[PDB]
Amino acid sequence: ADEPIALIGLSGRYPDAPTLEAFWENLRAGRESVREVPAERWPLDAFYEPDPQRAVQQGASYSKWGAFLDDFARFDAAFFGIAPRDAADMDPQERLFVESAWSVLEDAGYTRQRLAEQHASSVGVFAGITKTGFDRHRPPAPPAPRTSFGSLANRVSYLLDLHGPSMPIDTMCSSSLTAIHEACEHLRHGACELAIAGGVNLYLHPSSYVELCRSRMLATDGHCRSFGAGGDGFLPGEGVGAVLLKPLSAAEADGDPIHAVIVGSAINHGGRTNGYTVPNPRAQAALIRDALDRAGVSAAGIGYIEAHGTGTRLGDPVEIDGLTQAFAPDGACALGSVKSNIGHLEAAAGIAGLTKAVLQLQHGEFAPTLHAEQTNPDIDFAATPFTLQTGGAPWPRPADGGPRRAGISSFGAGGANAHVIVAEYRSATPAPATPAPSARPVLLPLSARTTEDLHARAGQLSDLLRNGAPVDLPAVAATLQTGREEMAERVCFVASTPGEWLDQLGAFLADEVPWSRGRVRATRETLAALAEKDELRALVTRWINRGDWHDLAAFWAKGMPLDWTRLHTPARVHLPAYPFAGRQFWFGP
Amino acid sequence: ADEPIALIGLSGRYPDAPTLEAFWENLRAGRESVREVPAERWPLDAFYEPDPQRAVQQGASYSKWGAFLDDFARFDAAFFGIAPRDAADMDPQERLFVESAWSVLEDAGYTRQRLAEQHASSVGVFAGITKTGFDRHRPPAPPAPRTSFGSLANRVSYLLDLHGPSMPIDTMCSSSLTAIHEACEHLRHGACELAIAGGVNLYLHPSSYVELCRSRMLATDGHCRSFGAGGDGFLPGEGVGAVLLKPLSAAEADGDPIHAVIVGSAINHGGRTNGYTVPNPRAQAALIRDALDRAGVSAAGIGYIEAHGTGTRLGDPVEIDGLTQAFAPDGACALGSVKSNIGHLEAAAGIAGLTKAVLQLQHGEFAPTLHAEQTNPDIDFAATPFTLQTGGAPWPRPADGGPRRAGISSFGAGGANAHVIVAEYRSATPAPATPAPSARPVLLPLSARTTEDLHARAGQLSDLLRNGAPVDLPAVAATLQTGREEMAERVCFVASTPGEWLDQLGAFLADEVPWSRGRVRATRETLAALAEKDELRALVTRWINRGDWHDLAAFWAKGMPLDWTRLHTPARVHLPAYPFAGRQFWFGP
Numbered sequence A, B: 001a002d003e004p005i006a007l008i009g010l011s012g013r014y015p016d017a018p019t020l021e022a023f024w025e026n027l028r029a030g031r032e033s034v035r036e037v038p039a040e041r042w043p044l045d046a047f048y049e050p051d052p053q054r055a056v057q058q059g060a061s062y063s064k065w066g067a068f069l070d071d072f073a074r075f076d077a078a079f080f081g082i083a084p085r086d087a088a089d090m091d092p093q094e095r096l097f098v099e100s101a102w103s104v105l106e107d108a109g110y111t112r113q114r115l116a117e118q119h120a121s122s123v124g125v126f127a128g129i130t131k132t133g134f135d136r137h138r139p140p141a142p143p144a145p146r147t148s149f150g151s152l153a154n155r156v157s158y159l160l161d162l163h164g165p166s167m168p169i170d171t172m173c174s175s176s177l178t179a180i181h182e183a184c185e186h187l188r189h190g191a192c193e194l195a196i197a198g199g200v201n202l203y204l205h206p207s208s209y210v211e212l213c214r215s216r217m218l219a220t221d222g223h224c225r226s227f228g229a230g231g232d233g234f235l236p237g238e239g240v241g242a243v244l245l246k247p248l249s250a251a252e253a254d255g256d257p258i259h260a261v262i263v264g265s266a267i268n269h270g271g272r273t274n275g276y277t278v279p280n281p282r283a284q285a286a287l288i289r290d291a292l293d294r295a296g297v298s299a300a301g302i303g304y305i306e307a308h309g310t311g312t313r314l315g316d317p318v319e320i321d322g323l324t325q326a327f328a329p330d331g332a333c334a335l336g337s338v339k340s341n342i343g344h345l346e347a348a349a350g351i352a353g354l355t356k357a358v359l360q361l362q363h364g365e366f367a368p369t370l371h372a373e374q375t376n377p378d379i380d381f382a383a384t385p386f387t388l389q390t391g392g393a394p395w396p397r398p399a400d401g402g403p404r405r406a407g408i409s410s411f412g413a414g415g416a417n418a419h420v421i422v423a424e425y426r427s428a429t430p431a432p433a434t435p436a437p438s439a440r441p442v443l444l445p446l447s448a449r450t451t452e453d454l455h456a457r458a459g460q461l462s463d464l465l466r467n468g469a470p471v472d473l474p475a476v477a478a479t480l481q482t483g484r485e486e487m488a489e490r491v492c493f494v495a496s497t498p499g500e501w502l503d504q505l506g507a508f509l510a511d512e513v514p515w516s517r518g519r520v521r522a523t524r525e526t527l528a529a530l531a532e533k534d535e536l537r538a539l540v541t542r543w544i545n546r547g548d549w550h551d552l553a554a555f556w557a558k559g560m561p562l563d564w565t566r567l568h569t570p571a572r573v574h575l576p577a578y579p580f581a582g583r584q585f586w587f588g589p
């Protein structure tokens, strides 16, 4: 009852994790990124009140902790042609999500031009967000801080020239997972050919904590003891994440690089319960059952549940109640929650959970769940089809022979629920050539907006070659050529082996030379007109025929356009996204 | 490329229009509901600055006008079991939309029970909203004003026990029209069996005007001269509106009352333009063409365009540019904008435009467009397929013999666009019985939460019988019986003709008597247990067989359950929705 949606682009920043590499390593190490509220956010002087009961009175907060995001206020405005003044006025949540949105494009190997020519720019944007408070800031001269849920999505669609549906998704705690679901639906029904979905969550004003405290939803100890004993409330967590989605059918045909596959998803509402924020286990069951059927998968086909897992006394047993009811017709299924690592990201909780699930699928490992040494007294997993993953362990292939599958749940405080089933992506791969692939010379073009960015890009690729990620030069070359935009500061390499390229990159970073360097400050139209000169056309044709790759490389580095299809199309691969290192835009505490 | 979605429920409140009857009469009369900012909103002392240039400096507003909504802060909290304290803290936008959401249910003739039994409560909620500012208020003791886009939808899903998708829609100026589109999509794809979609727009804080002024988007004269000469900016307008939607296939089968049919709709984004808020005529063309094709209708099949029509110098010609490009392959098509009547409702602009379009379709008339005596100099409609409807005129059936169709456009400031094509609903109706329908006695049950509400309900029905709306008693009876919830204060009539019923209602409002009055303060379960007594069952059966209708009426009025199917199912009709007259919840200026 559903068509598979390929996940071809993935980006994210999380507490103590500027990259997904760091994020996975933290998860693998069972790291908790809890921290007292940074001085730059707001002073704890008239904010923190140790006693929970006295805190609700006089409008304070009994929580001083939180998992915060580094460089939350940092934004490369110049990159997006945004004036410093305007950037200062837009919510940091929106700034971070723009960079994230660019990053998923690069990760997937899509340029703005390729989106236009190949998909008519029909790319939808569904951006999860629920947190406000940036409005409350009143900075000195006139500055006008503003949060626009619409702008979050629409500005992305603007800057990237996307013509698909563009809207925020605010279902509170389940926003980003609702967004990921809606994106999939629009793709299954042809509303758009690609879709960016994600979420962002920042705590910019102390009033956020005060409000969360008034409802007694924050943990008094500052932890998310998901399904652990002494479950109080949750720990506020920050983060940005996005995915680029496309129907598996189209992705495989277009040779897109595929992280994983969303095989089924669902959303609903709990309806009338005893209270406005009282969860409905019956609804959660129907929710997950719905997703299961659309994926055409029995509950016994799920290897891991990334649970909502807020870490509250009555909340966690309800979630397991709903899970048991859903898995009842179809035990020991691995269960945990990223909340125990980085807290509650609310709007960004879904994308964070999904990201962890994908990383688990890809690495074939279970990340431990923290604060579960003593399981919540009101739950015994022995009577459930589930088993709390307190420790790290390998994720073996199912006995079926099928794919690994994970279920991710996200439950909104207002009763809006979401569930996404994600499967490992497997495909027939031919045996490797022995003892190595063919050593043919390829052009490896590299560009960035500034020299500092250029060196950062090269640094990223050096780390890529060294950190054991599967690398075949021609695929990397093709992605650099057709999956990256041509920018002003350029360097182009010619190499036949990764070893040779790594040697070159090392030399370049430390600085005749084994590369062509160039600065191209010219319109595409001007450079095109030059390239159309007959003798210049003749030069390129000659160089290609005689295999003068270093001349072609020099030509490109100086600004000349090359028809890359003439130089051989291998499938594209995931290469490091733009190393944003923008300015800081923050009013202050 | 689309399935028809029936519009079976319609509700709305607009400036100088507490009911849609008043709204249509205002539109018919060419009335403008412009007004200076009410004292209860905010003082104009440190707010209004006559000079536009000096106003942007020192953070003021050069607009003092606006189309405002009566009883914006009024809310029947008791009706929804909401404590006065909590109601005070929720955004008036959310309060008004709850009442609206209940009203569309009653208009469509749906109870909460019928939704559950017949559709498993799979009703989606898509609520348009973009305006914030309620947060800015800091009332005395602790009160905490809050705007939650998620709650807007989720609270409705809660109170009404709905289990479908529940989310706000914020695409800025096009919110409600985006919401109506998304609702339709979810219905076409089986995401839910019914859907509530709508929008709300209030100006609760003066900062709203200040921000709109900074971008020079407000009119200096306080008018929406849509496609008229001297087009400045727009006039801020308030309003609440909602629709209840269901696939035409299901609606006709279930005998639902049908206002009109949404035959096609579309959304997109302008992409990269010269500025973030600079409209894309090319995108608007593709948008409308998209909707046209999904409806399977040529542009020559459209009788009226309800244009976005902000009333700006360069904005209006762009809209017509996009309209001409769209209508180019497939002149004099009627065109206008409700903006000229009630200003710019932004989030609620779409639903307001749609509502006007439906009222035009139903009455078969064109409402005039105001401030168009001098057409915008940069446009001549003579070269366009369109003609600006400056005056009121009948809307004749198309020469094709087909249905009347209207196109409604709504363009967001962030570049998110929406277009909905709406068609007249026509169906084979048998010739009326002469000289009158059969005069058989029917039970006409009436109930409300209080006596004041009960008398208000009866007043509504009296007006209904007198104002020439088509009335056949058995249909009205059936809707009162199965399309209204049974509440505490009850009165039940037995009548055979509308004349007789009207006589009774008149007597009742002025007060043996020709009705049974009752107050039922009891659980359904308690009353059910009584009704199950054998001799009581026997009584009802006897009464039905002997046709003792006044005894049955007395029985129901005293709290006894009647199986209404035993008393005859005619199709339901639109009866007046609950006459909400709640308390006022407003912090102050």
Ligand SMILES: [Cl-]
Binding pocket: A451, A511, A517
């Ligand atoms: Cl350099």
Ligand SMILES: [Cl-]
Binding pocket: B451, B511, B517
């Ligand atoms: Cl009375």
